[PDB]
Each structure stands twice: as C-alpha cells, then as structure tokens.
Amino acid sequence: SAQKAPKWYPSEDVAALKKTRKAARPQKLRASLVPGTVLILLAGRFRGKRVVYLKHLEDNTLLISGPFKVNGVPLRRVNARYVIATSTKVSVEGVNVEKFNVEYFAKEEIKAERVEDQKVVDKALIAEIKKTPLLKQYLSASFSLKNGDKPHMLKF
Amino acid sequence: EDDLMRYFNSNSNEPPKIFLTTNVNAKKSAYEFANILIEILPNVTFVKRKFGYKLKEISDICIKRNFTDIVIINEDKKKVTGLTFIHLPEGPTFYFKLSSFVEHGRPTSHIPELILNNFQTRLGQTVGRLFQSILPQNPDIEGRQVITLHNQRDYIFFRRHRYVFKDNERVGLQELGPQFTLKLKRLQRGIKEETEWEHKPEMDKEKKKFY
Amino acid sequence: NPAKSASARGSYLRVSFKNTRETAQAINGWELTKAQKYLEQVLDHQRAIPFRRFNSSIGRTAQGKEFGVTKARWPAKSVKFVQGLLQNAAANAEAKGLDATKLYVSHIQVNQAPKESSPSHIELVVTEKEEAVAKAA
Amino acid sequence: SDEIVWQVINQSFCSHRIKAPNGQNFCRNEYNVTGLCTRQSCPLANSKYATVKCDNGKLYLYMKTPERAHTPAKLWERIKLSKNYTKALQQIDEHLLHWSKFFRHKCKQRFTKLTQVMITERRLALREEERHYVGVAPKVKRREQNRERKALVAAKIEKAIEKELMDRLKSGA
Amino acid sequence: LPHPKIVKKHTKKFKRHHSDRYHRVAENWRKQKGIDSVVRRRFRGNISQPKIGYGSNKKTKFLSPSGHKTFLVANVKDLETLTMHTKTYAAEIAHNISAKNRVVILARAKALGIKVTNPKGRLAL
RNA sequence: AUAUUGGCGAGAGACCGAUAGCGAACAAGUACAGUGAUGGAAAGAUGAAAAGAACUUUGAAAAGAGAGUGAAAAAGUACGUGAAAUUGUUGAAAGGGAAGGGCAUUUGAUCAGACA
C-alpha cells in the first residue's frame, strides 16, 4: 500500500427502480393507412416498391404483401414511418390474413410453409387486382423521383 | 530408419491432406497468414476452430475424415508468432517461432521444387524430414519455382525464387513469396505427450552446438 | 538484404562538411561504374556537382542543366574523399563476392563530427540490382 | 474503547489502507466483509464483527465477540456453512439473529460471491488450453534478434541456391 | 455495473500559452500571472483555460469507458481486496511487476472474476 | 575547570553527491596568465575478469568489411545509462508575399477495449 484504503465505501446493494408511470397505449396511425391500400416503401431490401397494405400488427409494424407474384415482395413486416401511403385502395376482405402474428416472424433455405401461405394470400388478392385496369402494371413498376418532382407538392 | 520414413512422415504414395487450423479467437493477420499457407502446402483445408473439442476430440474427427497432418497458427497480439506441425497418427510434433514476415513476385499455379541446406545434425535432418514430407513431392520443373529451407544456425529461413539459366555457368533469381524465419521447439513425440528437445535459454550460452 | 550489400565508412575526416553533403547527394542512387566515371569527369572539369542547399555565391554554369540547377562547382577535395570510399566499397563487395556491374549506391549519408575544425563522418552502402526472372504456363 | 480506535485509524494511520485514485479506502485486514473500509465496516474499529472466509473449499463464517477483547488468540469463532446454497443462507441467518442488518445481508453477500468464485473449477475442468503465458526476458529478445541478423550475413542463401541448382542439374542433365 | 453515459466536457488538453512556440516552455499548464496578458483576460480566439465548470459528472468521475474505476495492484494480497467489488473497480497491474508475477496475478484475477485493465503486459510468446 | 577554523590520531551525521561538496574525488594549488605582488582553471565511471579484438580481405596509412572475445560491443580507450538544442539518411504530408494557436469536420496515418 500503495493507496491506503478509503474510510467510506459506496454500497454494493443494487437499488430497486422507482415505480414508472409509463403505460403502453396502442398506436394511433395516420388516416391514410386503411387496410387494403397501395403503399410505396422507402427503405430496405424493397426500396421504391409499390406494395399492398394488409394488416396492422401488435409490435407497431404493418403487414404488407406485393403480391410476390407481381413484383417480388413477399409477406413482409414494415414500419409505419418508412412508408408512403397513396390514395388508391384495393379490397382486402376476402383475404385470410388473421392467421399469422408476431410469433410467425420469430427468427432466433426458405421454409416451404412460407411459400404456401404466400400463394394462398396472393390468389385471394389477385382476385381483386384483376378488376381495375393497369393496377397490376402499377404494382409491378418501381416508384422513383424524376427530375422536377417536388414531394411537398406531389399529392400522392 | 527406412521403416521410420513411412511410419512417422508422409511419403510419395498419397496426396497428403493438411488440416490447417487457427488458435481460438484469432484476427485478420492469422487468416492473412493462412492465405499464404493455402498456396504453399499441397491439399489444405481451412478449419474455423470454434471453442472446445480439446485436442484428442479433434484427432477423432481427422481419423474419420482421414487427414495426414495438423497445422495450427497462433497469435498473442496482432502479429503471428508460433507455428505447430503435428502428424496425425503416432504424433511426431514440431513447434516453431516466427520473427520475420515482410511483403513483388506473384507466382504461377505451378508446384515449387524443394531445396534444403545444412542438416548435418540428426535432430536437424528430422526437421528436414518434416519439410520433405509436409511440402509437395510433385516438382514440375517448368514453371521454375524453388522453395528453400536454409539452416546455417539454429534459425531456418524459407524463401521462394525464380531461376533463369544462362549457359555461362551462372543463374539469376528474383525474390518471391513470404519472408520467414523459424525456430524449432519441443518435438513432443506423442500427440502432445512427451518431449525430445524443448529449447531453453540454458542454450545460447554455448554460442555453438546448433541442433 | 545485408547479404546483397557492402558498406564503407570514413570517420573524423578533415573535409568541409557542407561540400561533402552536396557531392554525396549528387551521387546518390547511381550505378557504381557510372558513379566512379562521373567523379573522374568532375576532377577534369567535364561535369560539375549540383549545389542545392549550401550554395551561396556559386558561379552559374551551363553544366548544371543536366540536374535542373543554375549553380554548380568542381570541389576537388570532397570528391577525392568520396571516390576513395567508393573504391573501398567496391573492394568490400568483391571481398563478399558480389557482382560489380549491377552494383549501385543505395544509402549514402554524411553528418558532422566532434570539433575550430568542421570535420565529417561519411558512410555509403552499395547494393546489387536484382532482376533475373522468368515464368511458365 | 472502539471510537478511540476508529478515530486513530480513520486519520493518524490504519497501516493496511489502500488509497485508490478514486479517493476510496480499502482495508486489507483479511477478516473484513466489504473490501472497502469505513466505520464499522472494518474489523478493527468495530467490536462485534462477522465475516465469511475460505481456507480450503470449506467456507467458514468467522465471528468476533467483544467478550474476547482481552484475548486476540481466539478472537474469531468460526462455523462451517454446509455446501448447498439454500440451507447455507438459512445457516447464516440464525447466527446473525439480533445483529445489525449490515452483517445480515453482507455475510449473505460474501457467501454469494465466494460461492461463485467456485467457477474456478469450471475453468479448471474445461481447461485443456494450448497456450500458457510465456515471459519475454530482454536478454532472450536480443539473443534471438542479434544472432538472426548474424545468421543471415553468414548464411549467403543466394550462393547456396546457386550452388545447389548447378550441382543438381549437372547430375540431373 | 449500471452507469450513466460519460460526458467529458473537455476532451482536449489544456496546453500552456506559447508552449508550442518555444521549446523551453513545457506543455504543462501554468496560469498567466501578468496583468497585460490577453490569455488571462480571456480574449476571443485565445486558448481555453482550466476552470471548475469543466468538472466531470460525479457519478461518472474517475471511470474508464467500461464504467470501472482503475485500481493499481502489485500482488495477490492487494488484488484480493477487490473480491467483493468486482463491477465497481478493475485491477491495474503496476508497471514494475515482473513477467513471472504478472501471470500469477492474471490467473488469480480470472478465478475471483476481478477485471484486469492491462493484460498483454509482458506476455510475449 | 576554560579556549582551541593549526598539528598529531580517532569517532560520528535527518549534510553535499562531480555546474554540488574545499579551488582541487583526477599529472590541483596543477596547466596557464601576469615584470612582479598575485590570479588561477577544466577534467570521475568499459567490463565480474582485458577476455582491450587472434586471423582473413580492402586501402599508402588512419581505418573498413568479415571473424572472434564477452551475458551484453545497443560496453571497443571518441568506452556505464546517453536527454534536448542542432544535423544526416530513410518513409508520410504540406507549401502562389509568413508561420505556430482555437472551435468543427472530411481525408490520410495510427491506436483502446468488448467476445470470458
């Protein structure tokens, strides 16, 4: 010694946290997100892609499909804020989206069950896209910004 | 003697498969070093070594998969330091120390010719025996690649070169491949259980001997 | 590589230091046969040494155009010491058993000595120029 | 008494203190619970003092009674603490009946850490490590530097290969 | 151990005025005593001075990036003091301890679970 | 009994540690300066032991390169350790009538843990 030991020592006992008054409330999404809406994704694997909006999930995500038959976007989870919501709406009532949840996407090649669930959903959704003209062509194509586009003026 | 040649060391009968592993939690320079051994040694497989499988448990795998030799490179810090050649059945095992690596040659896919220097000592020619075994016994003459293993002290230097013959009693050669210095240690005799030489600093006191 | 090298050294030499610096860097990186021939030409006023750092009141000459310098001189004494060392380093190389034709000075260095006098240490290290190479498909 | 013992070691020397750069004080008197030293957390100032220690694998809880201020030879009365954690904490509790809540949970805490020091066995059963720390003595650092530089000079590798290529391909013509 | 994020206030070194100009003036801080110094009267564009406003957060003072207070240790008996305080203090093996004894301290600190800030010190292979 | 900065001879120190301590740790009251009275310096350490480098080669020689001795010439009489000023070489970078400094970042260089 070589550093003479201190008289006082700080306590080893870990302090219990004070009672938090922060109760979780369900996400109040913007009015432009109605189940069965053509979306445009912004960030990720599928940036600039037109995408069908299906379900609001539990972990504040949104469940969305391409369909995978159309544009190569499967059943993905997506963030609310990373998404453009256009006005064009397709019908969604005939799709059995109610089955899967958050537990379906636990991660810890591709599972065959995922492909089968994709084809089951995609058939029931093409069943509505086939009605309105050029909408399948509109889903296949990629969104971009041409020289002279103002996003603050572009009423999407 | 002649029985030994085959029983402890690999001969020109098979292609010798060399199980190149690395010491646990190694970084860029070790794999950078493995890429230099990926060229020079005959049939290397690189095995990413993932904690456990102590040593005998490894030996069980390389009996089943049927390897001939194990080679393991280790790192204390960011530099490479030690190299361990073991023979998989019986276990004549050689440990080495590297104090030099400096890096304009860029070689072909042709297989290099061996050359050794100064192994008068019997312990020297048992190490000369290792590098005769562990490196390829193919030499394709054309391609003109030579691998040396010069040992004028207890220090062994290995280098690669390109030899050009002019008919006026002289040959030219350019520097190629990795610069290198090795030091022999241990000769563990069993897989790792026994010793035969194990360097101490009790030598260097003689200024001579040279094993 | 110390195996491909020979080195001469002169110490406590009664030369002008500032002249020696110029004639050392004038000969740096040159082949030995061209180097020794150059210093013979400096002695006979055929070529001149380019003075760059210690170069006040040097008479401007045409011979400096080789080196892109206006100023140049013929320092007999300093060169005499240097070609003595180069002759020594040539014999040092042939003592080891190097090639004479491919020989070039790699590292030539000159620094001041204990003193008034202004003496100087010189050391120069000659090296082989190794090419000699081939390939096969 | 003991207040007079404390003040004389608080300042005026407790000759086994370590002043850490944090300004902290550590009593290294082997019998203290907290490694830190403070009033009645160091075993000299206080008169009633409990502690858990280990001599072998056997974790004893030592205890100091003010009865034995006369005799320092048998100050620390000690009791073995089974080996199972649950019955040992219960074993602890009974000894600490009617004491400060300081020694109550702190000997409980000493026992906790010193039992999870027996993660040594975990390191020493699954040892089998092919490394082991080697010293680099600066004499050896130059016996294996300045002799390699002397090796290369006397080696003359180029001339050695130049010999044993001509001597090879004359005999292998 | 749970600690706040460390805010340093002044990462830079408080170098002495004209320590970079002259070689005889050390880089070690001294206050400009002279009344007509533009450093003392803290002008625009002059060097910043040590003052008590730059004081580090008391909860994160003396802490290494890992939230540990460094503690110098010479031998086993001094290392054994930090048995109870493993997530508060971390060991620092002193500069003068031999390579023979550093391996003793490192193995012992691994056993008790006390963190050593400087391994690889005299651990050449 | 008392005094004792000289002499003869001891014993000590909370003294100085080679720009200090006497002027002088040493060819020191020496070298030298002054007509003279006088004035008056600088200057310690190879290594345990010279084992102080046999021999070969380059050179007119001093020396150089090898070789050897030593635990170590990163101890070779210019010898313990060997700082800075100042200089040489090598590698990086910058530079149109200044430079160094502060705030912030890019770029290049380099580095710390955690993953025990």
Query: How would DSSP label each residue in A18-87?
Result: PPP----------TT--SSEEEEE-SSTTTTBEEEEEEE-SSS-EEEE--HHHHS--SEEE-STTEEEEE
Rounded to whole angstroms, the Cα distance separating B40 from B177 reads 9
What ranges do the domains of chain A cover?
6-156
Rounded to whole angstroms, the Cα distance separating A129 from A76 reads 19
Beginning with the edge strand found earlier in the chain, give each strand of the sheet holding B170-176 in spatial order.
Answer: B113-117, B145-150, B160-166, B170-176
- E63-E66-E70-E71 Cα dihedral, nearest 10 degrees: 130
Comparing CA positions, the residue from C68, C29, C34 lying closest to residue C51 is C68
Rounded to whole angstroms, the Cα distance separating D146 from E82 reads 43
The partner residues of B93 in beta bridges, in order of sequence, read: B86
Rounded to whole angstroms, the Cα distance separating C93 from A24 reads 85
Comparing CA positions, the residue from C92, C77, C97 lying closest to residue C124 is C92
Q: Is B143 near chain C, with CB under 8 Å?
A: yes
Interface with chain A: mutation pick from D36, D42, D105, highest number of A CBs within 10 Å: D36
Please answer yes or no on whether D117 and E100 come within 8 Å at the CB atom.
Answer: no
For residue D18, give every residue at least 6 positions away whose Cβ sits within 8 Å of its Cβ, in sequence order, or none.
A1, A2, A3, A4, A5, D25, D26, D28, E71, E78, E81
What ranges do the domains of chain E cover?
4-125
Long-range contacts of D13-16 (CB under 8 A, 24+ apart): D14/A4, D14/A5, D14/D42, D14/D44, D16/A1, D16/A5
Report all structural domains of chain B as residue ranges with CATH numbers, in order of start. Answer: 1-205 (3.40.50.10480)
The DSSP secondary-structure symbol of A151 reads T
What ranges do the domains of chain C cover?
1-137
Interface with chain D: mutation pick from A9, A13, A14, highest number of D CBs within 10 Å: A9
Rounded to whole angstroms, the Cα distance separating C115 from A25 reads 88
Long-range contacts of C69-72 (CB under 8 A, 24+ apart): C72/C48
At residue D167, what is the residue type?
D
Q: Which nucleotide is nearest to B78 (CA to C1')?
A: F111
Rounded to whole angstroms, the Cα distance separating C99 from B159 reads 21
Rounded to whole angstroms, the Cα distance separating B6 from B158 reads 24
Resolution in Å, one decimal place = 4.3
Whether the CB of E110 is less than 7 Å away from nucleic strand F comes out as yes
Q: Is B77 near chain E, with CB under 8 Å?
A: yes
For residue D112, give every residue at least 6 positions away whose Cβ sits within 8 Å of its Cβ, in sequence order, or none.
none
C-beta of residue A13 within 8 angstroms of C-beta of residue D105: yes
- List the chains bordering chain E where 3 or more Cβ pairs fall under 8 Å: A, B, D
CB atoms within 10 A of CB D173: 5
Q: Is the peptide bond before E65 cis (omega within 30 degrees of 0)?
A: no
Rounded to whole angstroms, the Cα distance separating B109 from C24 reads 45
The number of C-beta contacts closer than 8 angstroms across B and D is: 63
Q: Which of residues 81-140 of D touch strand F (CB under 7 A)?
A: 139
Whether the CB of E15 is less than 7 Å away from nucleic strand F comes out as yes
The DSSP secondary-structure symbol of B27 reads -
Rounded to whole angstroms, the Cα distance separating B159 from B145 reads 10
Q: What angle do CA A127, A130, A132 make, to 5 degrees?
A: 125
CB-closest option in E2, E84, E94 to A12: E84
Give Dmax (Cα) for chain E: 61
The partner residues of A76 in beta bridges, in order of sequence, read: A64
Residues of chain B neighbouring C132 (CB-CB closer than 8 A): 162, 164, 171-174
At residue C52, what is the residue type?
R
Beginning with the edge strand found earlier in the chain, give each strand of the sheet holding B80-87 in spatial order.
Answer: B43-47, B17-22, B69-75, B80-87, B93-97, B182-185, B155-156
Determine the 3-state secondary structure of E47 from DSSP.
Answer: coil
Q: Which residue's entry shows tokens 């609001």?
A: A56
Sign of CA pseudo-dihedral D141, D147, D153, D155: negative
For residue D134, give every residue at least 6 positions away whose Cβ sits within 8 Å of its Cβ, in sequence order, or none.
E123, E124, E125
Rounded to whole angstroms, the Cα distance separating E89 from E4 reads 16
Determine the 3-state secondary structure of D124 from DSSP.
Answer: helix
Q: Which residue's entry shows tokens 């010694």?
A: A1
Please answer yes or no on whether B81 and E120 come within 8 Å at the CB atom.
Answer: no
C-beta of residue D34 within 8 angstroms of C-beta of residue D41: yes
- E14-E16-E17-E23 Cα dihedral, nearest 10 degrees: -130
Give the H or E element holding residue C47: none
Q: Is E73 exposed, middle or buried (0-12, 13-18, 19+ CB in 10 A)?
A: buried
At residue B97, what is the residue type?
K
> How many angstroms separate the CA of C119 from the C1' of F43?
24
Rounded to whole angstroms, the Cα distance separating A81 from A30 reads 10
Q: Is the peptide bond before E26 cis (omega within 30 degrees of 0)?
A: no
Comparing CA positions, the residue from C82, D161, D77 lying closest to residue B112 is D161
Comparing CA positions, the residue from B119, B79, B117, B84 lying closest to residue B99 is B79
Q: Is A31 exposed, middle or buried (0-12, 13-18, 19+ CB in 10 A)?
A: exposed
Rounded to whole angstroms, the Cα distance separating C90 from C84 reads 10
C-beta of residue A115 within 8 angstroms of C-beta of residue A71: no
Q: Which of residues 31-60 of E touch strand F (CB under 7 A)?
A: 45, 47-48
Report all structural domains of chain D as residue ranges with CATH numbers, in order of start. Answer: 1-126 (3.30.390.110)
- B/e letters for C31-69, b = 16+ CB within 10 Å, e = fewer, are bbeebbebbeebeeeebbbbbeeeeeebeeeebbeebeb
